[PDB]
Amino acid sequence: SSQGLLGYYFSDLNFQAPMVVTSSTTGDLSIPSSELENIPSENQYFQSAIWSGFIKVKKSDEYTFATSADNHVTMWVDDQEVINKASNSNKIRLEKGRLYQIKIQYQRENPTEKGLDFKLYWTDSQNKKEVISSDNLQLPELKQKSSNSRKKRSTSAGPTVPDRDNDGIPDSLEVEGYTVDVKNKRTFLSPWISNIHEKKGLTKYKSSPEKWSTASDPYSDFEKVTGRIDKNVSPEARHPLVAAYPIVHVDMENIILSKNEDQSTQNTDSQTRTISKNTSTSRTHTSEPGSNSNSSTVAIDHSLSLAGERTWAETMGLNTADTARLNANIRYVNTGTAPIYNVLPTTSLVLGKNQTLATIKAKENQLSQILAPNNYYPSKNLAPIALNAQDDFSSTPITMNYNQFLELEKTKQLRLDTDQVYGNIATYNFENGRVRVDTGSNWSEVLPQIQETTARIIFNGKDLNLVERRIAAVNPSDPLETTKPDMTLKEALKIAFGFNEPNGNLQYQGKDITEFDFNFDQQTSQNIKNQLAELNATNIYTVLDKIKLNAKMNILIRDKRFHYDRNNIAVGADESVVKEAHREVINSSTEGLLLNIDKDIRKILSGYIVEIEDTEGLKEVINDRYDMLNISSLRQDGKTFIDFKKYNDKLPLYISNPNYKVNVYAVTKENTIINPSENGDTSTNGIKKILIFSKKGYEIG
């Protein structure tokens, strides 16, 4: 289907102006004018063509080759001319199993017909003549190295279309711009033409004629745009200027803490005294100078989980000489653009700044599934991974000493640092048109070059989670990288993150670019500042099409509605933003509130505080504990219910006098208290909170 001979069809007589590059499954090398919609009528006249590939025969025999136009043809079989601007009967000997290179050149001045009707035939010894069947034809070896059986360059004999990097796309097309269009069986690669392609909404591709993969990744520019690629590669990374590579972190979903058995305690029949909590994990980004790492930070829920207000040590019966154990459920998360097949990266679980508690490893070459971009391992429809799995006897206990345990109780934070060891790559094979894991290809041989030759943009517009993409961008200091096309900031956002521009305004899923801020590392900042100066531009948002990206830039783009911590996780929002987001109330009663709150807003809240204010201005706080703010819940209808009864002993609010007020406040994550105060107070006193509802008793009704 993606197999056959590779054809270059030129409008000129001398192989200089390629109009179509495409493959044919069989010896029928025709392109009917019917298929030439994406090309100017006057360019539909092909005056020359070149085909290349291999022939593989199923049965040894003497064959004669012929075409539809032997008078206008020269054909080579492994360096040997077999057709020379004349028909013949010259039999060449071909043995089973062996691969023979084919090159065919065709020239015809002033054809009176558009397109090309051209067929390649052969006749065996039993005088059967037919168009060469698909099972006999293979593509050229369009790789950076030759195969054991398939040479990567064609014979030096005759015409060679300029293709300096051997990806299959002619030099001139990569530099000047090309488009890819799908017919029924085939993809046509053609020159970009403004008045034809711009309105069809087609993508204008440019790539380096000297880089087989312009993003320095393991898939060629041609493989990408023709679909000759792992189907798990992200759609945006089918662009030659967008890097395809995995990006993995670990998501911890929950945790259970328990007291370690010790030799001194013979009795193992005591009551369960474990501490189980939900956890929230986010991939982070620090802008630590020059970082290329995977890390996520885990927040352990501080809300009420057990009776009493005991310390963790009291709860678990942990004395100063005891040790504790941690178990947890996790999944791996691929937020990058290429899949992983046979090695999951190794992860350190870290307490505080640098106390490693555990090393989390999966079994090499024994993965239960692929870990695909925009997906999880295990998939979300399957159980997560327990750090100590019930099956294996050999899972190492994740242990903490007493002082570390107290530290975890106080910080309620863990960090997961994951390496970039991703194993082997599934590559396309031109011999059989299949994609398979290549044991000779490893991500560790690719990632450094990707990181060195691309600009990185990290964007949080999808659910406020950080997503990293890398886009091919010139390095003015590296001659090879100057052969890449100019990459603008605007173009990068379109191709890497799917920004569009319906009315001259760049948007991401309906949000104008101006709704996001720009943040740069030191070197990138100075670079962009210089560019703006050179442009006499005072506002980056009005010149995004004129700002050029360079290799090694780091750009961080964030939703402006939110406040961010040092890990660039969203942790709060302006009082005015939070207020407005709670303005539309659906229903109110002494039982609670029913609102429609933006999904992003909910992400930055830790909970709510409910208060009744009497006529003299005194306030009764109903859920007056730092661990009792979790009173909101998302309903199946998407609406949020704030539950007044939960921490009111299951009772609706009692409002003594209709003139009393019910006030509800939102508490953002950055303002959230996660421990009792120093003086031991567990109340909400002093919590910085945002009034989001205030009605008198007669208004609630």
Binding site for Ca ion (CB under 5 A): 163, 165, 167, 169, 207, 221
Instruction: In angstroms, give the least distance from the CB of 144 to Ca ion.
Output: 11
Q: How far is the CB of 95 from Ca ion (least distance, A)?
A: 33
Nearer to Ca ion, 144 or 656 (CB): 144
Task: Tell me how far, at minimum, the Cβ of 29 lies from Ca ion, in Å.
Answer: 21
Q: Hey, which residues does 646 pair with through a beta bridge?
A: none
Quick one: which of 37, 20, 11 has its CA closest to 196? 37
Q: How far is the CB of 246 from Ca ion (least distance, A)?
A: 22
Of 233 and 610, CB closest to Ca ion: 233
CB of residue 416 to Ca ion, shortest distance in Å: 37
Amino acid at 384: P
DSSP state of 646: T
Of residues 455, 435, 415, the one with CA closest to residue 567: 415
Query: Given the complex with Ca ion, which of 18 and 336 has the nearer CB atom?
Result: 18
Nearer to Ca ion (CB atom), residue 27 or residue 53:
53
Query: At its nearest, how many Å lie between Ca ion and the CB of residue 599?
Result: 41
Instruction: Give the strand order in the sheet containing 120-123.
Output: 92-94, 61-67, 120-123, 129-131
Provide the minimum distance between the beta carbon of 126 and Ca ion in the complex, in angstroms, as a whole number. Answer: 42
Nearer residue to Ca ion within complex by CB, 64 or 214: 214
Given CA atoms 42, 45, 50, 52 in this order, what sign does their dihedral have?
positive
97: Cβ contacts below 8 Å, ≥ 6 apart = 56
Minimum CB distance to Ca ion smaller for 283 or for 484: 484
Instruction: Tell me the C-alpha distance between 348 and 679, whole Å.
Output: 35
What is the nearest approach in angstroms of Ca ion to the Cβ of residue 513? 30
DSSP conformation class of 271: P
CB of 480 to Ca ion, least distance (A): 11
Contact between 576 and 588 (Cβ < 8 Å)? no
d(CA 313, CA 324): 9
**In contact, 83 and 121? CB cutoff 8 Å:** no
* Nearest position to Ca ion, beta carbon: 221
Query: Which is nearest to 23 in space by CA: 111, 129, 113, 102?
Result: 102
Residue (243 or 547) nearer to Ca ion, CB: 243
Q: Which amino acid is at 312?
A: W
- The DSSP secondary structure of 513-557, one letter per residue, reads GGGEEEEE-HHHHHHHHHHHHHTT-S-GGG-TTTPBPBTT-EEEE
| Amino acid occupying residue 571 | V
Query: Cα dihedral angle (223, 229, 232, 235), rounded to 10 degrees?
Result: 30
> Nearest approach, Cβ of 138 to Ca ion (angstroms)?
19
Structure tokens, 399: 């242990």
Among the listed residues 285, 35, 289, the one whose alpha carbon sits nearest the alpha carbon of residue 181:
35
Q: Which is nearer to Ca ion, 94 or 169 (CB)?
A: 169
In the complex with Ca ion, the residue whose CB is nearer, 382 or 480, is 480
Nearer to Ca ion, 10 or 644 (CB): 10
